């Protein structure tokens, strides 16, 4: 009966991430649209009816949370936690509102912002804005396949959806974002191989490092968690390039969809803290968070009765 | 679990809407064809898969039913309702037997007619044939995005499909037809904010007026119905323009799916009656109706058991 | 000279839309004959990528004398009635043709709504057809329709008008007729029956050999070769329209030609027929309820105006 | 709740069906790769995420499956039955190991199948390789329109997948292969007509033939079969055209999946063997079976756990 | 017969704007880079063979051009003439080299850019870069389809490429370049029929005003320019939207090619000037140019014979 | 003007190459064909308008040449000549007739290779028949993007179209046809660096290493060549991979057109023989030539008067 966002929807090529803060008074005018979102998503993305594929998902911070709305929580609603590690940091950046906005044109999610934050206007401050566009064969900006072990199906709906655990929220989910850029001169620095060494996957290929040759330190290896039980802890990821040339700024903004942001966080902790077998993500050697949020996207129904 | 037909399926491209009658003694060449009709859709619509997107839909009218059929009857099924208005005439037309055809291509629906037709040569009179076409992004002939708040998924499926509420006919829909003819030297006599004002969205971005601006004779105002529940009463919409350069035809031809015909001819009601805020619709005074009939849409299974 | 897009490709929709001049009407059409083109421009670029959204435009014989002062093209004439023993291909009213093609019917219509809408009052539409693609380029027949056309270099010097008439190079004729078929009767044949009729296989769309090829065969009677040993040549934008109600099931035939000498002869070989055929064979199954003809000019011609 | 393998997935317009044979010390890879499979699926296939369409559904036969697992044996898996029929023969092949490798792409076919065959270098012999082609709108090498009956939905899933008549293998499928070369210069030397009566559907439009016109003897009657219950016993097939056109090589590649394949064998003993009023099917006249194997295909999680 | 840069190239949906000031010393990386543009677009474009449509061209400006090259110099090149006008003024801002990418997906534009910088760094400094996008049916960030009227076939050829007129640098044109940004909500103020009188054309249907009711100041009347002899002097526009929805940037970026940069000025000084009848053109009364740079950009030959 | 073959066209995704030798008595036969090659390439053809991109292009043997044709020879026909190099062997094998059949779908390729070969059966014996398929981004086997420094417009016609040195042949070419087998196992054996210096280019850019770096006995080292007048002679290649995964075969099917055979020939004993600079192309050691033969390429309007 819960009706889910669209965050179990697939990688598109092009989107749009949009993080605001609410300014002191503009609460009502943030409950307003929130209400009518998914009728705004409607009249634009009917137009590009069947190929368009736009959605928005939209989501709250822990503090915004409390200045919207009134009652229970969501069980693992807080701030992005900063973890400082011996050698590298994820920071946390403000952040009270995300939109993440998705199709196959760009002039779609542009069209479908401009609605946004036209309704916005004068009761929040921009935080951050990103136009993300698909590089080749779905590569980031280090120039490996992203978003291969992604889960699917029914895999994908059970390490994504609020379930029975918190049944009040069923059917919405955790977002994190974090901004990173790269360091493209010491990437390139490197041999090919090196690369694969750091990532855990053939460059051109895609596929999957023998358990023999792969590092412990590498991406591939810090990221697979198993829970106590055995079972693997997935997140559902929508990283998207983006870039300025002159600026040589080359970046990744990391998406990842959890149905608890525990899954993430000991993911993170795992990449910045490291664990016993090593120090840290060597992925982090080429890649500087600028940016840190949590969000909580709730289920359509939700944002619709407000 | 009964097995509907394509009465679900999104808006296409091109589309044929084919309305007859059924001649003295040809009850037995009709029901041979009703048996056929799902093998003849496959047969023409297998040769351009996957991006065919060929369907057809088959409607039969309250009188034509008693002619065909033994026992049960749909509990709405009944001849098209003509209401008399002060200024405006929703008008009853003949009509046995309903074909919408639709795909992503023309020659696909006409291929389709073509072998309809062929097998019903001599036992039906043609009442009415019309080949609709997609007009730029999903506009109709008054130049506004037409089917927007149309509704999807569960919500889709619960304001069309017939369910426990006669529980022989479970999966069958209400279909209304009317053809509309637009006085456009009318229309553009109107300023883009005027007509804004009529429809009750905005021309080019589709965006709904606020509830402060929309009027209350506004089309969108007068079709937005609630019953006794306090929830919305929705149809599917398959509109689709057509028309004749030469001859000053600019058409809709009006196709709305519904669960029981009683939501349909309620918005009928509105429109053509009034309410206690407004004489009749606005969209009326650029919109003549020169046709009108109901069929009931059966489940898949219950044509294929004949 | 800028021709007009009279060399274009075949595509998945058409609009033909035949009116006459009312008298009197003479000034308004003569002010949208220069408006045309950017019309045409104001719709297409629209859908600029993929739209491929043209218009021909053609002027009648009679409507040439009301309209302009001066040179008439050589070739222009009524076009020619021809009453043959068993089938006649009629002659019908027509003074401007406005051949009409994009990949979208949508771009077509919005076209000819702002044609017409100009034009209202002063013309009286005589005919219009929507065409469609059916399939893999067939007609209604069921046969690959547009095989032989002239292509490149060959299909410039078959379709332009050059030296011969140096006042109005870069344009050309356009012959129209709308048929209609009897697919009763045509489907009651064998698809080697059918294939005889038309000289080509009807699936691989391969042309019968000269040994087994009917003299009163389409292909046998429409190929011509004239005084020297060049084959005679025009471009065909058929395109297949209907009816399924009113059992209409039509092939609109445009055929254009840098003489209508050429698309004449071929005409004649099919209505009157010659030495060893009485007629062409797919006039069994075709009649034509429309026959016009039609010059049409150079770009330039139509925007200096 | 069980997973199973892309069995259900529509024609696309590129195949490649690789057949091999185990051998002796083989198992130990075999086993490696059966785990791997639906990793490097995702490997090679997330690179074309939209459009590419990658998938594998792989095949295990009898004598495999008892030299490569312990334990409970599919309740229908048993070797493909050779039929010796008066004329025509239906001759049993070896193997072992069905890669069934489709995409909308060839490129992506080949990349996944070297991928699977570099992993099993030395350890399995290759039996059968066939790259094949879609053939206009959806036609075979006899120039019919090929898959029209296939079921569609739900139809589909209960004729095709293994349920709660074998709990223990529920989301698998049972897959009979045969490659044809047909007789092309026989085959040409027919009348369209007399090619019409073979098959029990007219040629260019794929409509059916009446009941009362077609043959007895005629393809679609023979693979016509109705069970106990009075419905249709169904099949699902994703034949695909190949050949070579030097070596006057034109070929079907029959790939039929059912629920048991009990279902198979009837309409395989009905086609050689014959019935009451029909020596044999007409098809095989001009037909000829090179290979015949019989795999199970099972759910994707089974494959995963090894 | 010399061969021009895609020049004459149709509009895309996606493009780069590259525009950088060549620093001291860094004359011979410029040169370096200038030769081997080609082969880049090649090594980059070759990988989306059938409908990629990547295309790079380059511009060279004024100033650079006698720090670069020592032979004769395009008969028509020189530096953008600022115009200041009573309302509005058209800004001259610094711009060495131009890099025009197209391609129907911005992943080549980018792939591209990136190795035309790598080699340029430390030789070169950023001045500005924009990522356009189309927007719907061809439509600018004021809701107009923009591009209508722009010239093909051998229009185009006879507007756009240099000629016998100057026949060293044949094959050769002059780009002008202005990024302006809109007030959209001073535009979105007036209704469709007043912004109508502000283009000159229909909104929906792209169609032209009528001339007896086509306002004098308005921007179809004022960029329609007849030159002496009486035929319509015309330029080649790619414009592409661009923008930043949260820093509220709506802006149209213009890029126009032609034969002489005469009549691209022309249209210019008609604008911002105005003429006899009209103070100024009313598009700018809603748009603000924050760049203005002037470059030739050379015949293939030129950059690929610099060696 | 003489109309030439479409030698110009560029690479397509789909291509068939046939090579036949013509049999003692077969010459009526091929002359007839010949004829009509032309008219069977715009029947299968016009089927697939405008994306089909269905070409073909017929080369004749300098030995086939004086049995077809009376009358003068191009000046630059001869037999292939086999290159005994130190090391490796460009071999010369039979072959006639070539047609090189190209479209962005097989079938069409197939269909057309149908045809012609259904009129030449009893007159021809085939020796060589390649389906090609487009890999990834332009890529070859070697994973190296393929016919990145192919002329275009009027540099291409300058190399491929005979001209004024040969008059009475305008409009003609010459085709060397090359099958290469590649040692995959021992390639994948370099590491991507090696594979560079192999090549000559970056592997996943394509950019094309400096003159610094560049090894003398890299393939694109030892294919440039400049001519007289200082500037390089090119030639057009339409390279196309092909393969059988079972049997272990990754192969490029080369094929060059040059306006005369002098420029590809001394490109291939540069390869196969070497300079002073380099022992020979560093490509031999990883692929294999299996066939070579030489053709002429008439003007279209030289075949149909005949
Ligand atoms: C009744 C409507 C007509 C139909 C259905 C029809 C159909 C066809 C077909 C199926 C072909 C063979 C494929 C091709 O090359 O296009 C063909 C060829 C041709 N048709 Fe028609 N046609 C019609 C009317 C006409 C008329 C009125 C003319 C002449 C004024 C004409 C001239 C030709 C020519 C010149 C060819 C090519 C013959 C060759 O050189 O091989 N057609 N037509
Ligand atoms: C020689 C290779 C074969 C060819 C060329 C072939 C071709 C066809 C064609 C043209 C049809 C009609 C279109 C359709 O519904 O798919 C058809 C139907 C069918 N074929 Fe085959 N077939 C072949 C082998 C087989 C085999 C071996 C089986 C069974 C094991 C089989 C089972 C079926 C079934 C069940 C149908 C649907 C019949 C109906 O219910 O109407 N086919 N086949
Ligand atoms: C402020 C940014 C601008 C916008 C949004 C804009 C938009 C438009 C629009 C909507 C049209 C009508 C449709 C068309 O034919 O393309 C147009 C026409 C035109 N614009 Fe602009 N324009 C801008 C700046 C300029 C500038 C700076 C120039 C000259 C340097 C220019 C030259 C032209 C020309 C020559 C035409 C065609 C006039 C005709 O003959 O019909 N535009 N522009
Ligand atoms: C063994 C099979 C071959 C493979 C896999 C192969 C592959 C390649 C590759 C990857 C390139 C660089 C990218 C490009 O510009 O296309 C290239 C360039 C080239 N190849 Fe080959 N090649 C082969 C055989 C040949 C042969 C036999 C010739 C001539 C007889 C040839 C002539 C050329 C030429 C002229 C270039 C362009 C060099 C330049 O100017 O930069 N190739 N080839």
Redesign the interface.
């Known amino acids: 009966e819960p009706?889910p966002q669209m965050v179990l929807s697939?990688?598109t090529?092009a989107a749009?991430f949009?993080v605001?803060t609410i300014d002191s008074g503009g609460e009502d005018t943030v409950r307003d649209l929130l209400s009518d979102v998914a009728?705004?998503e409607?009249?634009?993305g009917?137009?590009?009816?069947?190929d368009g594929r736009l959605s928005c998902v939209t989501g709250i911070g822990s503090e915004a949370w409390d200045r919207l709305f009134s009652g229970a929580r969501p069980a693992g609603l807080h701030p992005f936690r900063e973890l400082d590690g011996p050698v590298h940091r994820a920071v946390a950046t403000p952040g009270d509102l995300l939109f993440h906005i998705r199709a196959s044109?760009?002039?779609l999610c542009?069209?479908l912002?401009?609605?946004i934050?036209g309704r916005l206007?004068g009761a929040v401050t921009?935080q951050?804005?990103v136009?993300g566009?698909?590089?080749?064969?779905?590569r980031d900006m280090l120039?490996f396949?992203d978003?291969?072990?992604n889960p699917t199906?029914?895999?994908a709906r059970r390490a994504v959806l609020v379930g029975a655990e918190d049944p009040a929220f069923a059917g919405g989910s955790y977002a994190v974002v974090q901004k990173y850029l790269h360091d493209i001169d010491a990437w390139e620095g490197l041999?090919?191989?090196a690369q694969e060494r750091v990532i855990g996957?053939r460059?051109?290929?895609?596929?999957?490092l023998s358990d023999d040759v792969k590092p412990a330190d590498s991406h591939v290896a810090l990221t697979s968690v198993t829970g106590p039980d055995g079972s693997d802890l997935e997140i559902l990821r929508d990283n998207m390039p983006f870039?300025?040339?002159?600026?040589?700024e080359?970046g990744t903004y990391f998406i990842g969809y959890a149905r608890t942001p525990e899954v993430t966080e000991t993911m993170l902790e795992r990449m910045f803290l490291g664990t016993a077998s090593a120090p840290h993500d060597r992925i982090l050697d080429f890649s500087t968070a600028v940016t840190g949020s949590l969000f909580f996207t709730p289920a359509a129904d939700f944002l619709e009765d407000l």
């Open positions: 009706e697939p990688l090529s749009i949009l605001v009728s705004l409607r009249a634009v009917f137009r590009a009816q069947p044109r760009l002039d542009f069209a912002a401009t609605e934050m206007r921009p951050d804005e136009h566009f698909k590089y080749f064969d779905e120039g396949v978003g291969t072990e199906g029914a895999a041999s090919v191989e996957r460059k051109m290929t895609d596929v999957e870039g300025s040339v002159g600026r040589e080359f």
